[PDB]
Symmetry: C3
Subunit: 115 residues, 3 copies
Protein backbone atom coordinates (compact mmCIF):
# COMPACT_ATOMS: atom_id res chain seq x y z
CA UNK A 1 0.00 0.00 0.00
CA UNK A 2 1.17 3.55 -0.78
CA UNK A 3 -0.51 7.02 -0.84
CA UNK A 4 0.69 10.14 -2.61
CA UNK A 5 -0.47 13.73 -1.96
CA UNK A 6 0.38 16.84 -4.03
CA UNK A 7 -0.41 20.27 -2.56
CA UNK A 8 0.01 23.04 -5.11
CA UNK A 9 -0.82 26.69 -5.86
CA UNK A 10 -1.38 25.75 -9.52
CA UNK A 11 -5.07 26.27 -10.43
CA UNK A 12 -7.54 23.38 -10.73
CA UNK A 13 -8.02 24.14 -14.45
CA UNK A 14 -4.32 23.50 -15.05
CA UNK A 15 -4.52 19.91 -13.78
CA UNK A 16 -4.88 17.85 -16.99
CA UNK A 17 -7.46 15.11 -17.43
CA UNK A 18 -5.94 11.76 -16.54
CA UNK A 19 -3.48 13.25 -14.06
CA UNK A 20 -4.62 11.08 -11.14
CA UNK A 21 -4.61 7.91 -13.28
CA UNK A 22 -1.12 8.69 -14.56
CA UNK A 23 0.14 9.18 -10.99
CA UNK A 24 -1.50 5.89 -9.91
CA UNK A 25 0.15 3.96 -12.78
CA UNK A 26 3.60 5.48 -12.53
CA UNK A 27 3.63 4.94 -8.76
CA UNK A 28 2.37 1.35 -8.98
CA UNK A 29 5.18 0.74 -11.46
CA UNK A 30 7.85 2.57 -9.47
CA UNK A 31 7.02 0.93 -6.10
CA UNK A 32 6.27 -2.44 -7.64
CA UNK A 33 2.87 -2.53 -5.93
CA UNK A 34 -0.33 -3.47 -7.75
CA UNK A 35 -2.33 -0.30 -8.66
CA UNK A 36 -5.27 -1.52 -6.48
CA UNK A 37 -3.14 -0.49 -3.49
CA UNK A 38 -2.14 2.98 -4.70
CA UNK A 39 -4.14 6.00 -3.48
CA UNK A 40 -3.60 9.51 -4.91
CA UNK A 41 -4.77 12.95 -3.70
CA UNK A 42 -4.23 16.24 -5.62
CA UNK A 43 -4.93 19.59 -3.96
CA UNK A 44 -4.73 22.61 -6.30
CA UNK A 45 -5.45 26.32 -5.76
CA UNK A 46 -3.50 26.41 -2.51
CA UNK A 47 -2.17 29.49 -0.72
CA UNK A 48 1.57 28.65 -0.75
CA UNK A 49 5.06 30.13 -0.93
CA UNK A 50 8.37 28.38 -1.67
CA UNK A 51 11.54 30.30 -0.85
CA UNK A 52 9.28 33.28 -0.23
CA UNK A 53 7.94 33.26 -3.81
CA UNK A 54 4.40 32.41 -4.94
CA UNK A 55 5.36 31.12 -8.39
CA UNK A 56 4.22 27.50 -9.10
CA UNK A 57 5.39 25.09 -6.40
CA UNK A 58 4.36 21.88 -4.66
CA UNK A 59 4.65 20.19 -1.25
CA UNK A 60 4.08 16.41 -1.51
CA UNK A 61 4.14 13.23 0.59
CA UNK A 62 4.53 9.57 -0.28
CA UNK A 63 3.64 7.22 2.58
CA UNK A 64 4.44 3.62 1.73
CA UNK A 65 4.62 0.34 3.62
CA UNK A 66 8.19 -0.46 2.57
CA UNK A 67 9.84 0.44 -0.75
CA UNK A 68 11.36 3.52 0.91
CA UNK A 69 15.12 4.05 0.86
CA UNK A 70 18.02 6.25 -0.23
CA UNK A 71 18.12 5.06 -3.85
CA UNK A 72 14.39 4.41 -4.24
CA UNK A 73 13.54 7.90 -2.95
CA UNK A 74 15.97 9.39 -5.50
CA UNK A 75 14.21 7.64 -8.41
CA UNK A 76 10.79 8.52 -6.95
CA UNK A 77 11.82 12.20 -6.89
CA UNK A 78 13.12 12.11 -10.46
CA UNK A 79 9.87 10.46 -11.61
CA UNK A 80 7.58 12.68 -9.49
CA UNK A 81 9.38 15.98 -10.34
CA UNK A 82 9.34 15.03 -14.05
CA UNK A 83 5.57 14.55 -13.90
CA UNK A 84 4.89 17.82 -12.00
CA UNK A 85 7.17 19.75 -14.41
CA UNK A 86 5.58 18.31 -17.56
CA UNK A 87 1.96 18.17 -16.34
CA UNK A 88 1.64 21.14 -13.96
CA UNK A 89 4.54 23.31 -15.23
CA UNK A 90 6.18 23.29 -11.80
CA UNK A 91 9.93 23.70 -11.70
CA UNK A 92 11.63 20.69 -9.98
CA UNK A 93 13.54 23.01 -7.66
CA UNK A 94 10.24 24.38 -6.28
CA UNK A 95 9.06 20.93 -5.13
CA UNK A 96 9.47 19.08 -1.82
CA UNK A 97 8.42 15.44 -1.40
CA UNK A 98 8.49 13.90 2.08
CA UNK A 99 8.92 10.12 2.15
CA UNK A 100 7.50 7.96 4.98
CA UNK A 101 8.16 4.25 5.42
CA UNK A 102 5.03 3.17 7.28
CA UNK A 103 4.97 0.15 9.60
CA UNK A 104 2.13 -2.20 8.53
CA UNK A 105 0.67 -2.05 12.06
CA UNK A 106 0.33 1.74 11.67
CA UNK A 107 -1.81 1.68 8.47
CA UNK A 108 -5.52 0.95 8.91
CA UNK A 109 -7.66 -0.35 6.06
CA UNK A 110 -10.88 -2.38 5.77
CA UNK A 111 -11.73 -2.36 9.51
CA UNK A 112 -8.23 -3.51 10.59
CA UNK A 113 -4.56 -2.77 9.84
CA UNK A 114 -1.96 -4.37 7.55
CA UNK A 115 -0.14 -5.99 10.49
Amino acid sequence: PAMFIVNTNVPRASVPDGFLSELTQQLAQATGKPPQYIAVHVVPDQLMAFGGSSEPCALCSLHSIGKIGGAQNRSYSKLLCGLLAERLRISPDRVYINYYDMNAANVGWNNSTFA
Copy 2:
Protein backbone atom coordinates in the same frame (compact mmCIF):
# COMPACT_ATOMS: atom_id res chain seq x y z
CA PRO B 1 -3.81 15.02 22.94
CA ALA B 2 -4.80 13.52 19.56
CA MET B 3 -5.82 14.94 16.12
CA PHE B 4 -7.76 13.19 13.37
CA ILE B 5 -8.00 14.28 9.71
CA VAL B 6 -10.30 12.81 7.01
CA ASN B 7 -9.64 13.71 3.36
CA THR B 8 -12.43 12.56 1.09
CA ASN B 9 -13.95 13.00 -2.39
CA VAL B 10 -17.44 12.81 -0.86
CA PRO B 11 -19.23 16.19 -1.30
CA ARG B 12 -19.60 18.67 1.57
CA ALA B 13 -23.40 18.30 1.48
CA SER B 14 -23.03 14.59 2.28
CA VAL B 15 -21.27 15.29 5.58
CA PRO B 16 -24.10 15.04 8.17
CA ASP B 17 -24.64 17.64 10.89
CA GLY B 18 -22.91 16.55 14.08
CA PHE B 19 -20.22 14.58 12.22
CA LEU B 20 -17.31 16.45 13.81
CA SER B 21 -18.86 16.15 17.29
CA GLU B 22 -19.42 12.41 16.83
CA LEU B 23 -15.79 11.95 15.76
CA THR B 24 -14.58 13.95 18.78
CA GLN B 25 -16.65 11.87 21.22
CA GLN B 26 -15.87 8.45 19.73
CA LEU B 27 -12.15 9.27 19.60
CA ALA B 28 -12.06 10.66 23.15
CA GLN B 29 -13.73 7.43 24.25
CA ALA B 30 -11.52 5.16 22.15
CA THR B 31 -8.21 6.80 23.16
CA GLY B 32 -9.32 7.42 26.74
CA LYS B 33 -8.41 11.10 26.46
CA PRO B 34 -10.68 13.92 27.63
CA PRO B 35 -12.56 15.43 24.63
CA GLN B 36 -10.95 18.83 25.41
CA TYR B 37 -7.74 17.40 23.91
CA ILE B 38 -9.22 15.92 20.74
CA ALA B 39 -9.01 17.96 17.51
CA VAL B 40 -10.84 16.91 14.31
CA HIS B 41 -10.51 18.11 10.68
CA VAL B 42 -12.76 16.96 7.80
CA VAL B 43 -11.89 17.84 4.20
CA PRO B 44 -14.58 16.93 1.63
CA ASP B 45 -14.81 17.55 -2.13
CA GLN B 46 -11.27 16.34 -2.73
CA LEU B 47 -9.75 15.26 -6.05
CA MET B 48 -8.82 11.67 -5.15
CA ALA B 49 -8.43 8.14 -6.53
CA PHE B 50 -8.11 4.87 -4.59
CA GLY B 51 -6.94 1.83 -6.54
CA GLY B 52 -7.33 3.96 -9.66
CA SER B 53 -11.07 4.51 -9.01
CA SER B 54 -12.80 7.78 -8.06
CA GLU B 55 -15.69 6.16 -6.19
CA PRO B 56 -16.04 7.35 -2.54
CA CYS B 57 -12.79 6.90 -0.61
CA ALA B 58 -10.84 8.49 2.28
CA LEU B 59 -7.20 9.05 3.32
CA CYS B 60 -6.98 9.79 7.07
CA SER B 61 -4.44 10.37 9.85
CA LEU B 62 -4.56 10.01 13.61
CA HIS B 63 -1.63 11.66 15.42
CA SER B 64 -1.71 10.85 19.11
CA ILE B 65 0.67 11.29 22.04
CA GLY B 66 0.61 7.63 23.05
CA LYS B 67 -2.34 5.24 22.80
CA ILE B 68 -0.90 3.95 19.50
CA GLY B 69 -0.19 0.25 19.06
CA GLY B 70 -0.94 -2.96 17.17
CA ALA B 71 -4.20 -3.78 18.96
CA GLN B 72 -5.32 -0.17 19.56
CA ASN B 73 -4.83 0.75 15.90
CA ARG B 74 -6.97 -2.26 14.91
CA SER B 75 -9.88 -1.09 17.11
CA TYR B 76 -9.39 2.50 15.91
CA SER B 77 -9.70 1.31 12.31
CA LYS B 78 -12.83 -0.72 13.02
CA LEU B 79 -14.39 2.29 14.79
CA LEU B 80 -13.25 4.85 12.21
CA CYS B 81 -14.21 2.72 9.15
CA GLY B 82 -17.61 2.01 10.69
CA LEU B 83 -18.22 5.75 11.06
CA LEU B 84 -17.09 6.60 7.50
CA ALA B 85 -19.23 3.78 6.07
CA GLU B 86 -22.37 4.71 8.02
CA ARG B 87 -21.97 8.51 7.87
CA LEU B 88 -20.26 9.16 4.52
CA ARG B 89 -21.17 5.94 2.66
CA ILE B 90 -17.51 5.08 2.13
CA SER B 91 -16.63 1.43 1.78
CA PRO B 92 -14.13 0.32 4.49
CA ASP B 93 -11.83 -1.17 1.83
CA ARG B 94 -11.49 2.27 0.19
CA VAL B 95 -10.07 3.86 3.35
CA TYR B 96 -6.48 4.31 4.59
CA ILE B 97 -5.72 5.61 8.10
CA ASN B 98 -2.11 6.40 9.03
CA TYR B 99 -1.32 6.22 12.73
CA TYR B 100 1.40 8.34 14.35
CA ASP B 101 2.57 8.01 17.95
CA MET B 102 3.86 11.54 18.64
CA ASN B 103 6.51 12.27 21.23
CA ALA B 104 5.22 14.95 23.68
CA ALA B 105 8.27 17.13 22.89
CA ASN B 106 7.21 17.16 19.21
CA VAL B 107 3.67 18.55 19.78
CA GLY B 108 3.38 22.30 20.32
CA TRP B 109 0.37 23.83 22.10
CA ASN B 110 -0.33 27.02 24.06
CA ASN B 111 3.09 28.66 23.39
CA SER B 112 5.06 25.55 24.46
CA THR B 113 5.04 21.77 23.89
CA PHE B 114 3.72 18.83 25.89
CA ALA B 115 7.23 17.82 27.06
Copy 3:
Protein backbone atom coordinates in the same frame (compact mmCIF):
# COMPACT_ATOMS: atom_id res chain seq x y z
CA PRO C 1 15.04 22.77 4.26
CA ALA C 2 11.81 23.15 6.26
CA MET C 3 8.07 23.32 5.44
CA PHE C 4 5.26 24.72 7.56
CA ILE C 5 1.53 24.10 7.13
CA VAL C 6 -1.35 25.85 8.97
CA ASN C 7 -4.85 24.36 8.72
CA THR C 8 -7.49 26.68 10.16
CA ASN C 9 -11.23 27.37 10.28
CA VAL C 10 -10.47 31.11 10.14
CA PRO C 11 -11.83 32.57 6.86
CA ARG C 12 -9.57 33.40 3.91
CA ALA C 13 -10.43 37.12 4.21
CA SER C 14 -9.00 37.16 7.73
CA VAL C 15 -5.53 36.09 6.53
CA PRO C 16 -3.64 39.40 6.26
CA ASP C 17 -1.58 40.36 3.23
CA GLY C 18 2.05 39.42 3.79
CA PHE C 19 1.20 36.54 6.14
CA LEU C 20 3.06 33.93 4.07
CA SER C 21 6.11 36.22 3.75
CA GLU C 22 6.15 36.88 7.48
CA LEU C 23 6.00 33.14 8.23
CA THR C 24 8.84 32.49 5.74
CA GLN C 25 11.08 35.13 7.34
CA GLN C 26 10.33 34.26 10.95
CA LEU C 27 10.92 30.56 10.26
CA ALA C 28 14.13 31.16 8.30
CA GLN C 29 15.35 33.21 11.26
CA ALA C 30 14.16 30.71 13.88
CA THR C 31 15.61 27.61 12.18
CA GLY C 32 18.70 29.43 10.97
CA LYS C 33 18.06 28.27 7.41
CA PRO C 34 18.23 30.58 4.39
CA PRO C 35 14.69 31.67 3.35
CA GLN C 36 15.22 30.06 -0.10
CA TYR C 37 14.74 26.70 1.67
CA ILE C 38 11.58 27.57 3.62
CA ALA C 39 8.20 26.56 2.16
CA VAL C 40 4.88 27.72 3.67
CA HIS C 41 1.28 26.53 3.14
CA VAL C 42 -1.80 28.19 4.70
CA VAL C 43 -5.20 26.51 4.46
CA PRO C 44 -8.15 28.63 5.72
CA ASP C 45 -11.92 28.01 5.74
CA GLN C 46 -11.51 24.50 7.12
CA LEU C 47 -14.19 22.36 8.76
CA MET C 48 -12.54 21.85 12.16
CA ALA C 49 -13.20 21.39 15.88
CA PHE C 50 -10.75 21.68 18.78
CA GLY C 51 -11.90 20.32 22.15
CA GLY C 52 -15.33 19.88 20.57
CA SER C 53 -15.62 23.62 19.80
CA SER C 54 -15.61 25.34 16.41
CA GLU C 55 -14.18 28.66 17.63
CA PRO C 56 -10.95 29.72 15.85
CA CYS C 57 -8.29 26.98 16.01
CA ALA C 58 -5.35 25.60 14.00
CA LEU C 59 -3.60 22.26 13.38
CA CYS C 60 -0.08 22.82 12.02
CA SER C 61 3.08 20.87 11.04
CA LEU C 62 6.72 21.83 10.74
CA HIS C 63 8.85 19.29 8.88
CA SER C 64 12.51 20.17 9.04
CA ILE C 65 15.77 18.47 8.16
CA GLY C 66 17.35 18.95 11.58
CA LYS C 67 16.79 21.91 13.92
CA ILE C 68 14.15 19.87 15.78
CA GLY C 69 14.46 19.30 19.53
CA GLY C 70 12.97 19.81 22.97
CA ALA C 71 14.11 23.42 23.43
CA GLN C 72 13.90 24.42 19.76
CA ASN C 73 10.32 23.13 19.48
CA ARG C 74 9.40 25.17 22.59
CA SER C 75 10.68 28.42 21.00
CA TYR C 76 9.06 27.46 17.67
CA SER C 77 5.69 27.07 19.43
CA LYS C 78 6.05 30.39 21.24
CA LEU C 79 6.91 32.12 17.96
CA LEU C 80 4.27 30.29 15.90
CA CYS C 81 1.46 30.68 18.48
CA GLY C 82 2.30 34.39 18.85
CA LEU C 83 1.93 34.87 15.10
CA LEU C 84 -1.38 32.94 14.86
CA ALA C 85 -2.78 34.88 17.84
CA GLU C 86 -1.74 38.30 16.53
CA ARG C 87 -2.42 37.66 12.83
CA LEU C 88 -5.35 35.24 12.78
CA ARG C 89 -6.83 35.92 16.24
CA ILE C 90 -6.39 32.28 17.25
CA SER C 91 -5.98 31.54 20.93
CA PRO C 92 -2.63 29.75 21.64
CA ASP C 93 -4.46 27.06 23.58
CA ARG C 94 -6.51 26.14 20.48
CA VAL C 95 -3.40 25.37 18.38
CA TYR C 96 -1.46 22.11 17.83
CA ILE C 97 1.86 22.05 15.95
CA ASN C 98 3.42 18.67 15.11
CA TYR C 99 7.19 18.71 14.70
CA TYR C 100 9.02 16.29 12.38
CA ASP C 101 12.78 15.92 12.12
CA MET C 102 13.15 14.64 8.56
CA ASN C 103 16.13 12.52 7.44
CA ALA C 104 17.75 14.13 4.37
CA ALA C 105 17.33 10.86 2.43
CA ASN C 106 13.54 11.13 2.98
CA VAL C 107 13.07 14.61 1.44
CA GLY C 108 12.97 14.81 -2.35
CA TRP C 109 13.73 18.02 -4.22
CA ASN C 110 14.96 18.96 -7.71
CA ASN C 111 14.83 15.39 -9.14
CA SER C 112 16.75 13.81 -6.23
CA THR C 113 16.84 13.94 -2.40
CA PHE C 114 18.95 15.86 0.13
CA ALA C 115 20.98 12.73 1.01
